[PDB]
Amino acid sequence: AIKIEIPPDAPPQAVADAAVAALRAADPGAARRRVTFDVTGPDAARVQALADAVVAALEREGFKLEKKEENTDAAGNAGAKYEGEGGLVLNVKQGPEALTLKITVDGRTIVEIVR
Numbered sequence: 283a284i285k286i287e288i289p290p291d292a293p294p295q296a297v298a299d300a301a302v303a304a305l306r307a308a309d310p311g312a313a314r315r316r317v318t319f320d321v322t323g324p325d326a327a328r329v330q331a332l333a334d335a336v337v338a339a340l341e342r343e344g345f346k347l348e349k350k351e352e353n354t355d356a357a358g359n360a361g362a363k364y365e366g367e368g369g370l371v372l373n374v375k376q377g378p379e380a381l382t383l384k385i386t387v388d389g390r391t392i393v394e395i396v397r
Contacts, residue, residue, distance in 0.1 A: 284307065
């Protein structure tokens with residue numbers, strides 16, 4: 283597993299690309315498994331910017347995502363779910379903790395990037 287602290291000025295595409303590279307370094311076979319990306323943070327707009335960057339990075343690897351749903355929980359936190367083939371999921375969720383991108387492979391957290 284890898285955890286990265288990334289400078290607060292790194293643009294979302296640099297964050298997404300670091301996570302995909304970290305994933306390849308930690309599990310080069312992850313593409314064959316059940317993979318969930320989780321993008322969470324307090325500012326709804328920075329959260330969506332990083333989610334968009336994750337979609338773009340995966341699309342370049344050949345992994346297509348479809349927005350399945352938008353949602354709002356009891357606190358009013360906005361969220362969204364994207365799914366691809368093979369159980370690929372991208373969960374997007376507003377929450378108090380610092381902006382984070384996590385990658386879980388077969389139920390185990392493999393990559394965490396915190397801003």
